[PDB]
């Protein structure tokens, strides 16, 4: 039949026959790109070899030799002649790019006479014999099976013998010698057969090898069995070699169709005369800007320019191209969508849309959503970062570049910042009492605490850098000094944090500011046009809200209420409630917080101006609101007229073997309804009042945490409804409200249909859901997850990336089941995964109404959502 | 149409029309039982009333009056005549027995003249006017709506006025008075209408009321909407009244067809002449044995005897009957399957099979499986238990009656038991070091620890009583004394425990011994014939095994391995391993346990004699194997040449926020494979050797705890297989083995299909599964579960009874999915639920291969299984 196709005789649709490489080479040849000319041995020729019992059909060989003759005629010179020798590259390629890799052999055709003609033409004998000796080795390794060892020993001998120190320091005369030693090895392995001197023996050997290598053990067997059986094989691509060091009319270069750092249209790049690509990357000789090529060789410049524009137009996006000029003849070695940055991605996309080269849809889909984080947090010279001294590392709690003078107390950091200094707050951990200092800091570094720690969460809300859980640190509070890595640091000593990698740097050089871009804003709008998912945010204060809404947030998916009991002015009321011994004494202590909490609630609604807000009732156990220090325990006993013991008895009574699965959330409302009632009163009055005050309508959303059973929710629901309806009566209002639940307990997802019968909405708390589905606590998972990631047990952080295969099932289910009893059931996600692109896309596909993420990730979600809608 | 049926004109198949009561009355009338004669107003008559706008059709009324005339003719006396007045009972009954109850009115037909004839006939005027005044009240309450209050005030007045103290102390002359006061109240509520003096007005009133009461709010609306709509209603049953206090030829009695305490065939019971049932129960007059009735009234005795046997034969089981003789005329008021005990249940069932009255299948199904626990643990006079002084209560860890002298140390209890004393071990908690004392104790009482505590588990294995988690106790170790409830108790002071209720009793009177019964053994065999589920047991030592197998266990579903590291002679090796800082130093420390553990394993296989055993690898975190006391921490530092600090740094390093979801189980093998290898070595050599030693074949089963992901298991599986196959080589054996996993992590159940690809069997660890599905820790659940049970949130302990609706789903799923990849996949259950009848039945239905429970529950499972097979 026909087992050999020239690149001009194929296209992308003959992928099956020519392999993925072969067809792509053909494609680019049709595009008028002067690729080094060649042909392809078909994947059917790989099938015929195996059906001939490891003996290539004379037919095939002949058609290979025929195509070889064709190449020679084009190139004007034979295969290994003495004047201008033809050399080729053999590359293997299947229908698919796949796990378990393919082979590449360069300089095929070299021999004892071709090596000389090559040295004459290049004017560099050292370069000629260097290539020969490499070819000899690579051929012997791939074609036959002579180990590198035999060759590596001899190179180590000669280098060591001549007192030289590296793979390079060899003279032309030494490579000549080494090449003969190498040939001797092949002969000393092939029962006295000389190194494939025959250019044709070389070719075939390489063609045989390629087909042969498809039948080897592991990678191979897996790919055939699982993927798709039938008649798969592998193609062999044979291509002419190029050179840009043959003289003053010869060169090599690399250029971009557009500027990869800024995104400005127009050729950008470099090149060198009489050199190979290596020499360009090496910069020993100052590479000359691409545009100067018009001065040296206008003819080639012109051709170059045209084809570049043709490439850009065909691929429809900024191309990164490698080129080589051989004795006034232009060749193109490689082309690919060039690399760039977030600001650049946007800018180019926009341009591309305005130039009419791409659609808006396409612009949106092609931008890497995770990159957008770059636009929001400052960055100092990437050279200065690599030039920076790493003294440790930890968890990247909140992204950003932070740099400033270190201080060890919230007040000293604030006071220092107020004097005009860049401040870095270093503590064991933070608390709500240190909030004022946190805000004034450029960053925050903690000794203990994970992603969910007090420092990590508050810092994401404030859009402030945060590196947490750095155990290597050793703070000396009294001295105001801390040890890490190479030395101790005192108050005022500058440091640098990388909130994106978790890296901590010794020194003082501030980053820049957070840049904006219309292109950003333009993309957002396009994103909006396409997305279906509304995006809400997780916010606990007005500031955070405002920033979130500034970045497109449509409301609050999760409003935590813990702080409203934690703060200095509140904690006394909760504490008192905790240590009381009467339902009446509890209710009284709790009423004393209403004003303070209602006042918090007002402010939120003020800031949301009609946007919805999901409020999560009290989620953690009472254990956390009681003092853990004999000092505070004493202070409190003093304040309520109790003994230090009696308080201590209460504290230990509250002690729980596994606080993650104790008396908390819904289970706490069940025992002490008084808590819920109070939170309901505060919320409901807060809304009603702001409604009257502005006429802005409000629909409060009340969310019950840690629900696992229908009747459970119903107990609590009843309480809240009775109270809400009371507050309505008292202020004569008709305000609508909704009660829903968190789905963070596997059971709740399994019986979602029953749960829905009461719950008006479902919020997936995928944090606590993941914990329980996998059966581990985030805070204790560090001490093996690392070992798991190494061992490839897990390829992704399940707390950072939603686990679709396992956790996903429950979510999907929960939704499907919820809508069976309540068709118009709204479902969102409020975990950290809500700002994870792949997670969002899942959420889209399974049918959620919205996602919720930290304020400064809203943009990534917004985009992510739009992509998911377009991908499905 | 026809709206009134006499009892002789119905049967069980006309349930729809006559209601459940009406049809059952008819049935028993066909059985030749001289029931007080009557009729039934149909449920269609309830429909016609509602379709007539609350006005009874003359048709219906007439057919009621017609049936009334019929009753009168039978009874020979009119409705409220002056000589021998006819009185009736009105009872309402629907097609179904249901939630939300029906009404009963007695003595219908009483009035100002009938009350006199009644007092004359009975010879007891106080009894006559007492009934009148009650009727007057009950009628006014039910028929009209006069509250009890109006009547209760007047009774309280007269009682208080006459200086009497109770509802009884009234004279005939005072009841006469009170009846007139009562009539005045009705007249003073019914706009001057006299108390329904007319016997017919009374009847109708009661008939109207019944139909009326079907339309009331809650219970009613729920039952109609959900259950089954169409044309439901309620029937009215009207029945003649009886009396056994009319004279010396009149009486009342209660008898059993067989002895309810021992199960011996033959009439058993009591009776009284000239009395009502009350008087029998009262025992003021010494009731005369039933068999003496033949002396008083032979004619009635004879009739009685026949009908009793007829009843027994019809219902096909020991009947408990109430009877009344009125002036030489025998009537039967009630019959039901009499009550009995476990030993009695068996004995009667067996008898019933031998007498040919029931099939074997039927015998099996009718025995209450949970009762069987009575046969295994001794019990002292139930009077003495109620006569016993309760000083506290706690959790019923291990059932039994324990009574003995208290001791506070394992050694003192043993030493005391060795001298011949009944011992009761009271500690804060137990440990493996106290095992010798535990065995020697009649019971065990602990201050802390739940059902899964060290005392609860070891005591179930040993079949020893155990009441755990009694926080009220205050042990004084040095003094050897402890406070609870009313007083402090010293060493030697006797106490009593109830391992079935958790009750603790002050005193010294031992129970009896554990009785056996062929009937037991006979039932087991019948059970075997029917069950499909094999039953295995959870056992950690040979003794336990032996007892389990003695009670029918077919092998070990779960063999815990924790103790093999915990014990005094082992703990040093684990400790050393823990504090090591080298893979090599870990491996060496672990090898030192092989002999001790292999030696444990040998003994098990010795005891199992070919029966299979599932071995669970190390499940708890390393934190538990390290010393928690500065003393021991110091001792260990001394033993390994470390500082007290350095040990303390290691201990705190291992500290975990939530130990239930930390670095343990599979996750521990992942990091420290060395542990698994060692456990595999020990197991594999242990099996091989015993195999050679006896020729008894063995198939070791190796079970990995806390698996959540396919590749996770595979990592560990590889390790174990490499090692097992080594040990095989080393001893030149061809012994088969299987590796499976525990399914206690929700995820594992969700991806069971993937997990199965490696796991050769699945064991449901429904303990840890429930914890995680519900999202709570058993140990912390006490402080609200109580509140949940009260509030009817949960009607069952999910740790004691499998939660089919929620947890069940995962199990079911796990099985279905596992068998998709591995059809011949064996699945068992090893949690506490394995000995819970309803759980077993689930396990049966979803397809498990076997169940596993604590040795002394094997019998309940065996039975339970047989029932499930017959029920499905």
Short mmCIF file of C-alpha atoms in Angstrom, two decimals, chain A residues 653-663 667 670-671 709 711-712 745-747 750 771-777 779-780 783-784 787-788 792-794 803 806 809-810 817, chain B residues 653-663 667 670-671 709 711-712 745-747 750 771-777 779-780 783-784 787-788 792-794 803 806 809-810 817:
data_model
loop_
_atom_site.label_atom_id
_atom_site.label_comp_id
_atom_site.label_asym_id
_atom_site.label_seq_id
_atom_site.Cartn_x
_atom_site.Cartn_y
_atom_site.Cartn_z
CA UNK A 653 -17.45 19.84 82.46
CA UNK A 654 -17.58 21.49 79.02
CA UNK A 655 -14.36 19.65 77.94
CA UNK A 656 -14.88 17.44 74.83
CA UNK A 657 -12.75 14.57 73.49
CA UNK A 658 -13.50 15.62 69.91
CA UNK A 659 -14.62 19.29 69.75
CA UNK A 660 -15.30 19.01 66.02
CA UNK A 661 -18.17 16.58 66.74
CA UNK A 662 -19.56 17.69 70.11
CA UNK A 663 -22.27 19.80 71.68
CA UNK A 667 -27.23 20.63 69.01
CA UNK A 670 -31.62 22.25 71.01
CA UNK A 671 -30.49 22.27 74.62
CA UNK A 709 -31.96 15.11 60.88
CA UNK A 711 -36.90 16.87 63.10
CA UNK A 712 -33.74 18.32 64.52
CA UNK A 745 -22.96 16.47 57.91
CA UNK A 746 -22.98 13.50 55.58
CA UNK A 747 -26.36 12.34 56.89
CA UNK A 750 -28.18 11.46 52.46
CA UNK A 771 -13.58 16.71 57.08
CA UNK A 772 -16.29 14.17 57.87
CA UNK A 773 -16.49 12.40 54.52
CA UNK A 774 -12.77 11.73 54.49
CA UNK A 775 -12.88 11.17 58.18
CA UNK A 776 -10.22 13.62 59.25
CA UNK A 777 -9.69 16.97 60.96
CA UNK A 779 -5.89 20.74 61.90
CA UNK A 780 -4.38 17.20 62.43
CA UNK A 783 1.28 15.10 59.79
CA UNK A 784 0.52 12.65 56.95
CA UNK A 787 3.31 11.77 53.00
CA UNK A 788 0.18 11.13 50.99
CA UNK A 792 0.72 10.11 44.98
CA UNK A 793 -2.14 8.84 47.14
CA UNK A 794 -3.70 12.24 46.75
CA UNK A 803 -13.17 16.20 45.97
CA UNK A 806 -16.04 11.40 46.92
CA UNK A 809 -21.32 12.64 45.35
CA UNK A 810 -22.99 13.88 48.51
CA UNK A 817 -32.94 14.96 46.71
CA UNK B 653 4.11 16.46 69.15
CA UNK B 654 1.78 13.45 68.94
CA UNK B 655 -1.09 15.48 70.53
CA UNK B 656 -4.21 15.69 68.27
CA UNK B 657 -7.16 18.11 68.39
CA UNK B 658 -9.54 15.34 67.34
CA UNK B 659 -8.05 11.88 68.06
CA UNK B 660 -11.00 10.16 66.41
CA UNK B 661 -9.92 11.60 63.02
CA UNK B 662 -6.12 11.82 63.22
CA UNK B 663 -2.97 9.95 62.31
CA UNK B 667 -2.85 6.46 57.81
CA UNK B 670 1.23 4.67 55.35
CA UNK B 671 3.81 6.69 57.24
CA UNK B 709 -9.45 5.74 49.16
CA UNK B 711 -4.91 3.76 46.35
CA UNK B 712 -4.60 4.22 50.07
CA UNK B 745 -15.39 6.07 56.67
CA UNK B 746 -18.30 7.43 54.67
CA UNK B 747 -16.10 7.93 51.60
CA UNK B 750 -19.36 6.02 48.52
CA UNK B 771 -20.04 8.43 64.51
CA UNK B 772 -19.01 10.05 61.24
CA UNK B 773 -22.31 9.88 59.39
CA UNK B 774 -24.15 11.60 62.22
CA UNK B 775 -21.15 13.75 62.80
CA UNK B 776 -20.61 13.06 66.47
CA UNK B 777 -18.32 11.25 68.92
CA UNK B 779 -17.96 9.77 74.13
CA UNK B 780 -19.28 13.42 73.90
CA UNK B 783 -24.60 15.71 77.04
CA UNK B 784 -27.45 16.18 74.54
CA UNK B 787 -32.27 15.94 75.49
CA UNK B 788 -32.83 14.55 72.03
CA UNK B 792 -38.48 12.76 70.48
CA UNK B 793 -35.82 13.91 68.02
CA UNK B 794 -34.41 10.43 68.17
CA UNK B 803 -29.78 3.81 61.80
CA UNK B 806 -29.26 7.31 57.36
CA UNK B 809 -27.95 3.90 53.07
CA UNK B 810 -24.17 3.82 53.04
CA UNK B 817 -21.09 -1.05 44.65
#
